[model samples]
Target: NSNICEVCNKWGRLFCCDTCPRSFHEHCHIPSVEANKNPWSCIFCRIKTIQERCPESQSGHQESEVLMRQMLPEEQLKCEFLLLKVYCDSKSCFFASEPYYNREGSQGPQKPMWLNKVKTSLNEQMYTRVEGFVQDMRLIFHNHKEFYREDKFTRLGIQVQDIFEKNFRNIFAIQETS
Candidate 1:
């Protein structure tokens, strides 16, 4: 078992996955791992478990054009993973459930967005394409960056954006054109 969180790559008391070697800090894992759960599993392993039980669900993208088309089931799962990954970050709560931020309409009035709203859109299947989700995620971070300027929260948003970018490429297996 790893000593550091797979997501944050930081040292701390970690929750080791029962099915995989990966481990995560309580605040860094999706759903915030707690308690002595006997059969804790990481998201990747859980996805595989589902795929193993239903082989038909394992099919990769069949469409020639992936980015523009409606997201596949696997793609949707990847999106969910990304969103939950965002949720795992401690600073994410500030972005997700800040009632005060929402009320303060004076700042960043250009259609402020947040992680919670993105999660809702995802849950409601409002995003027809993966790009829509990508744009919204970027919007949340960008809005914070612009509104806060050089504040600590802006820096934190950058960190979250970095994590999101790395995982987005990995989960989607995106090949950089550059």
Candidate 2:
């Protein structure tokens, strides 16, 4: 009798929700549609069952749409893993999301000055959940190669994954599913 993960209550490999008494875990249900789907209802009970079968989804909810629906898909993937670690430390040093890769510029490692403790760990979540915050997010990805010495944010960039791609993976990648 051990099933949990009603949005991270903590148990293992759970995904049982037919309509209520909910459960989830497959990466908290992002495209993990339980073997091509069956009886499901987890996305906050299908958006409170479509705001109770339509009330204009409750007067066009706002506040960044209720702060992106109470935000807890691993705290919205830990705010995109701390904005992809400051866009891989601004692509190894030419900050402001660089693009020009020529003419003596971007020789790498120009000093982001490690963004004040990663923006104080993104305005101080400081690591809340997500399995001890995924081992403290690997100590903020080797913090400028242990305090600099040609760190160049040391590889792994995404142009900050394209600026969280429109406020976060396209609205959480359209609610993580197909």
Q: What lDDT tens digits, residue by residue, belong to model 1 across residues 12-35?
A: 887889999999887555445757
TM-score to native of every candidate shown: 0.62, 0.25
Which segments of model 1 are wrong by more than 4 Å?
Answer: 1-42, 48-66, 98-106, 176-178
Instruction: Say which candidate scores most in TM-score.
Output: 1
Give stretches of model 2 more than 4 Å off.
Answer: 1-63, 66-68, 71-73, 80-82, 89-92, 95-119, 126-161, 174-178
Q: How many angstroms is residue 4 displaced in model 1 relative to the true structure, after the best TM-score fit? A: 14
Residue-wise C-alpha lDDT for candidate 2, range 23-119, written one tens digit per residue: 6677444334457567675555554444466655334323243343433644544354434434333342333322322324234333332433443
Clashing pairs in 1: none
lDDT of each: 0.72, 0.44
Candidate 2, residue 178: Cα displacement in angstroms equals 19
TM-score of 2: 0.25
Model 1 Cα shift for residue 27 (angstroms):
14
